[PDB]
Amino acid sequence: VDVKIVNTVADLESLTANDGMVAYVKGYYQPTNFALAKPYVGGGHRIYVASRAAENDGFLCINGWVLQIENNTVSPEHAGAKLNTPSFDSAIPIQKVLISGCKVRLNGLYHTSVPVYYNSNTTIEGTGELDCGFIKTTNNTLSLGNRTINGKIMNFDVDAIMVAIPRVGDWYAQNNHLSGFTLQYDSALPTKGIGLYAPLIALSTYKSILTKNTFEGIKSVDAWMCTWERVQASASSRSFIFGHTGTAWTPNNTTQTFIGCWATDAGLYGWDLNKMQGCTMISCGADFVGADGSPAKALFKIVYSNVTMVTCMNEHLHAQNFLYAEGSEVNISNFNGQAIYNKYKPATSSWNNNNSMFCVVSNSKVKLTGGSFGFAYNSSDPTQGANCSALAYVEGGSVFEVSPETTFAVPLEEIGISSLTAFTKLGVYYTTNASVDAYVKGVRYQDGAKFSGLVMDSYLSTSAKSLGNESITNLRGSLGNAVLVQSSTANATVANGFPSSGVPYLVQQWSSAAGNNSYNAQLAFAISSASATFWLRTGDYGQAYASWCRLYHYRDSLIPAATNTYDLGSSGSTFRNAYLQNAVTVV
Amino acid sequence: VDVKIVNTVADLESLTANDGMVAYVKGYYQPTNFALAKPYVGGGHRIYVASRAAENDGFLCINGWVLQIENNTVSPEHAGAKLNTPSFDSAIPIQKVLISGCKVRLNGLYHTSVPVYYNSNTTIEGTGELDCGFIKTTNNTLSLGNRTINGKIMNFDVDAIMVAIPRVGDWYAQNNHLSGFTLQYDSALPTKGIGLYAPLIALSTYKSILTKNTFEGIKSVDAWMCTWERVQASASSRSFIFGHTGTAWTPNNTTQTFIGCWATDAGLYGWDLNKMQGCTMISCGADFVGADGSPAKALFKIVYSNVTMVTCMNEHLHAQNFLYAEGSEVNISNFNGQAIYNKYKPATSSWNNNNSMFCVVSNSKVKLTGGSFGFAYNSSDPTQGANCSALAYVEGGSVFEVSPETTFAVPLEEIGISSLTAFTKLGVYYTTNASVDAYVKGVRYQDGAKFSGLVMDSYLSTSAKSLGNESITNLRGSLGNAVLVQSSTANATVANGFPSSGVPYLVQQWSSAAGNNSYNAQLAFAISSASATFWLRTGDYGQAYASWCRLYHYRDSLIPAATNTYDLGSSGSTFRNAYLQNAVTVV
Amino acid sequence: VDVKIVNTVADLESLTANDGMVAYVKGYYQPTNFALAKPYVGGGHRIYVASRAAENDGFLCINGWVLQIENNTVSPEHAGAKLNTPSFDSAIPIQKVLISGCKVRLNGLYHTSVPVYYNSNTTIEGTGELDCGFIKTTNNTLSLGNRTINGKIMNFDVDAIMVAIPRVGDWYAQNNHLSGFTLQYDSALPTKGIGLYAPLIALSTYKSILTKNTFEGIKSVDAWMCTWERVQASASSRSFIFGHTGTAWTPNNTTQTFIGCWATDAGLYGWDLNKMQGCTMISCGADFVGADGSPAKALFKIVYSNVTMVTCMNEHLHAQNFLYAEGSEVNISNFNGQAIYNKYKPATSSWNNNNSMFCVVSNSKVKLTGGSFGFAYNSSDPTQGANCSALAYVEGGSVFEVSPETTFAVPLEEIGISSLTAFTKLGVYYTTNASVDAYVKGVRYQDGAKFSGLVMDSYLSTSAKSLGNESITNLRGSLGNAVLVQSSTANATVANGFPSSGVPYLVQQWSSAAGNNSYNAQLAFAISSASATFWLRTGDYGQAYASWCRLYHYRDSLIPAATNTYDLGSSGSTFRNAYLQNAVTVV
Ligand SMILES: [Zn+2]
């Protein structure tokens, strides 16, 4: 007995067959374009199972004829999809193969009028993102209704292209391995939806997946142990959303890795991350987030998360914040950020809504380890200087660290404590309940409870601060304990607080602490070519400096500061003897 | 002339055939469940090769009928395995396809009574870890015996599920690419073995592989240039073992990458790493290592290795050490460790067996770059305070570094040199041959040979240390060179070491070094509202401070410390002239 | 009607068939070795399309017989390639399948006389790099000629094995996914070429690809959003080249990730990187770069790039530089470099051509975050010490940072400002227009415009520098503001600059800044067991120290430094009264 030829699966119904007969189906449908290189698709061998003659699911069993699957791999064509045929709705055939338990190969573009879903242990593989994937032509949803999962009412009937749904009885859509295809809406649709709605996912790999022409690219609530490699989310509003708060399920995430992923076009947030724990981004990028005159809120919104960004990038950013960090630890190492137009302000500012590139709030920790940040504007810009952002606002127990090798397209301007939430210079502003360790203009500034002291069993060598035309009387606010040098005899003047003009000085200043009020002392060395005079003075807290006091020593006469004022000894504390070469001169 | 149908491969034996005849085999076996969606498996086209009529290997050539392989891909079914049939031993068919040179697709669960091995250039692909893989039902081994490899006697006859074995004449099982399946023992076995025994491996990728119900998960001796992505090792003893010392082969490893890998359930070590050079872990996790009252020895045991952990995690840890590092460099960046019950102690302690979270020994280097560590207990805990661990023990030339932004669930308690190996506070303890650079309670402590000095061509501005009700005579052990402020007049007393009571002070203390004994000097500014007194004293090494000395200066009388004791001049060193307003008063 | 058997595709031409007939072709060619396990390859089902009877492309349509492709996957055999047949040129069949739009499976070694190219959306999968891939047997090129792409005339007619070419109308060969094969020249060819010439590529993944027996391994001009996993480039001149400057296209690159990649054998550069932005290397290696007596120029040449290396390695390096960095930011974290023979020098040195391990020029930023660097030689080495390199040369606005936990095989020797470009010690040399923050022999050295000051609202406790038999008069070049201790009475001598010999000292030195010339002052405490003498002196800029001055205080007599020289008071500023126990002694 020999293998019988059948033109299409539709021809199987009428065929006369004995149990166990084998047929070769040329294609699922008759080709409509015989000029194609690949006209016959979706066919293959079938074996007749007489006991199932009444069954017809349009795919694995058609009138008893069971599809012979090679190495457990099928394509949507085998269930009746059509390739690169925009007028044909492939939704039903795609859905059948996605839940078949087979590996699914995507071999062109398939058009769909409803979302398609996958569950667990599903491998889907196309050959690349230009030519393989799903094009959704409507805003229609699934029609599955509510399900209760771990006591939470969940619903998957959203306007999306693809949806991840746990198996019945499970909590996560897990052990899935998707690669090499695109998810897009028909660009003509006036309203777009979600690319991939994957609320509850785990233990999965996503590679070389492109979603574009979406409102929201990739959207999840609770994801754990997933890797994302070369995933691009192009969206009009938010590209990547993790920890979505809009369901009954409590957001939480762990161990998400993103390698070579790409956020583009988002007008609200590039990345919207909530409860993202153990998250690493490696050589990721973000292009064209926000637009001129229509800023995004932030490139990265990172809330109750801990994230490391390793050699990541952005190009062309119009946003109020570069990073909004709330309750989050973010280590940004060797970033390269370009064309960031930091000219946007909120209508009404507040602790968590302000014009800073790094908005670091509510016990966050943000560190810039090297990197280059192309923030276009500081207050001296001739076109946007009046609109420039701060570099950072740090509040509510947070800490912000900037390495000495981090670079910026234009100079930083200042750093200091601030009670404001609206800024006018490219500076680092922090509250009294915050900590900073930041280089600004080559000077490292450390302040706050995390930086209370430095105790080292080590020797220390430092340089003096070289003074310009400035008063050493008026350094109580700007310097604490510090060594000063005045090497210009023109600037070493009595008007500038020195005991005598016209000679260089080294000055040790002591302080309780630089501040609005302080205790101070100074030791001044008036350094001449082969001699010096030595001077001490003190400043009480809230008082002007007291008069300078010239020290008496054995290589100088003892000349009092005023005549007929000071004594040698007292009646109760005499000097024992006095040895003079000449008799006392009584004036 | 036409393709002939054959029901099963067993039917090929009796088929009279001409050379070059083509047959289509419906399936390897007759189906036993025609309700399956996929009842016929393991069949395919065969061509008769008359000159091989006597051959039957049950797979590629059956009584001369040669299997026609599509794109060099086969399944164990093609050699006679059965899917999801626990009573059927698929060991032999699996082994045949694994050494066939074909890509191997795994399409369900296959049960095995012996280990299965792979060599080199082997690609094995399942669709996911829930439904694809090998279930081993015995503790049986391979039966290959000893082989000599590079002069070393090696033996692969261990109780494992899968074994990597070099090709004959080669040193490594290399250029393998495994993905998307599980290796498990039957949970009913009283004793379990190794999931993957891969002693000598190289130049390979492992992705989306789960081992569970094992004693040891993944075990290797010499691995180089391998990547591991989404590999989970669930084991009762040790999850991941690299550089295993128990063979004739010298352990050594290079360039192993772990991305999104997961160690679970291990009761001895989560990771046991030996000679692991150039190893990166990215967003890996570890859950349920140890149990309450049954601690693991360490989450990570890292010996003669260098490892970077980037945004890794753990949840639920009962162990004596978090990290044991011996001769190892470990950089832990932005960790997030949760529910670590640091209440375990060894019965006898030693340099390399002690109750510390970070046991940093024998020329190790361990750095915590940020991160959050959920160590539950310090000595204040009401229920486990008497059982808490140290944060760290550092010895034998090692260095331990804790960044200022690293956080802990409960506060660190102290840091200091210790000769003990058993601790009772959540502190940092180090020997005289160790180095530390660690923030404790907002104070950075640097000590040891790696931190001998700081030489900066930079100015320095610092604050004073504000004293409480403290003696400045008794700061020789706790402070070195340091500026002090006493802003409370009530505490500026002679009993507290001040020369002049009841005014605020700035004090410069000098020291050889804080310690049990030291050289010291102090300069004290006794600050009043418009004047001060200036004082010096010294303390010799091993001696009490000498008396305070009030300096003479040109804005004060010269009143000696005691009457009729000190002279103006000497017979051999006179003052030249003396100018007094009044005649000398001879008392 | 049944499926008709056909022996070979050559037998199709003489097949009388009706429209729609189905044939099964045993193999593309008649097998020549029926002892093979897989003798029949490249066949499959075909369907006769009468309207195309005149077409014969040797692949998808042979005299009207259209190939039935399963799940859009083919092998070069289906177009007439031969496996493991060195005398057969498979170039034309390979090329046909690479541009077919199918997934391409590689099932052995194919030999080629010309390069083969791919465009976009191409997936190519072998089972491993030992047995799958392309062997090029000539130095022949493509013959496609000049093409204008985005305004630049490009030419792809180079001697390469595989070439990436954009589709017409596109700028990049993109969305390709290649894995699991090798690209090699016939080792017998006297001259080798490029392995993979991929000038313009984007949005792609490359995995488990080996190039070897090449002159240049992988060569690109403009690559963005590509990942490379387990890619090995073995080349005689340069292993990896990105940003190749030798075309009309302006070099630029972004977001390239390398995980477990390996550069070997290169004699000029291991990695030659130009305009590589956002690049991360993870657990990559480099072996046998340069040769003894024939050094490479550098292991890494990194120009106008920013690169992070995470736990990377090298073994066996003969090169003039380890890293040449020009206008680049490079963070090298936890490196492990072994067997680096730093004994090579240029014939004529210059700012960008010198004998340094880290040549850090033109506004570069290079940081060593931990790591271990096996530089074999410093100047005391008994076989090569006279040839040793510097550790680093830092110039032209660059910054070089060395962490305290970075280790070296042999000790570093010195650090300082240098006007030289040729070195003879393993030191850190930098220009006056450069910055350093580097530990050397346990001491942190910070200098340059990036390290101008440190301002901390924090207290500070430090140790004294313990002096040997050294002069405190000659510490103006080596220390600035510093505390010194001399605990040896034998070394506290007038010859060593002390004012009073034979007692231990604490000394506070002040300075404008350590340098060739400086302002200085010193306060010396000559410490006896229950007393001290207190001394001040100053040194003017460019002058020797002035004489020491012993301070007068109330617990000492006032003995002048010379007799009959100094006065008590002056005619114009008298002391008011004098209280003596005895009458003045007029000497
Ligand atoms: Zn067939």
Question: How would you sum up this structure, described in words?
Answer:
The structure is a homotrimer of 587-residue chains. Chain A has one helix and 52 strands. With 587 residues, chain A is mainly beta. In chain A, the strands form four sheets. Chain A has a 35-stranded mixed sheet that branches. A six-stranded mixed sheet of chain A has the order 45-46-47-48-49-50, with no helix packed on it. The longest helix of chain A has 8 residues, at 91-98. In chain A, 64% of the residues are buried. Chains in contact: A-B, A-C, B-C. At the A-B interface, β18, β19, β21, β25 and β28 of A face β6, β42, β43, β44 and β45 of B. Bound molecules: zinc ion. Chains A, B, C: GO terms for molecular function: metal ion binding. Chains A, B, C: Keywords: Coiled coil, Metal-binding, Viral tail protein, Virion, Zinc. Chains A, B, C: It is found in: Virion. Chains A, B, C: This is Tail spike protein.
Q: Give the structural class of chain A.
A: mainly beta
Helix count from the secondary structure assignment of chain A: 1
Q: Report the largest inter-chain contact.
A: A-B, 130 and 133 residues
**How big a fraction of the residues of chain A is strand?**
35-45%
**Which word captures the global form of chain A?**
rod-shaped
Query: N-to-C terminal Cα separation of chain A, in Å?
Result: 146 Å
| Bound ligands, each once | zinc ion
Number of domains of chain A: 2
Counting copies of identical and different chains, the oligomeric state is homotrimer
- Total beta strands of chain A: 52
Q: Any idea what the radius of gyration of chain A is?
A: 38 Å
Helix content of chain A: under 10%
Biggest sheet overview of chain A: 35 strands, mixed
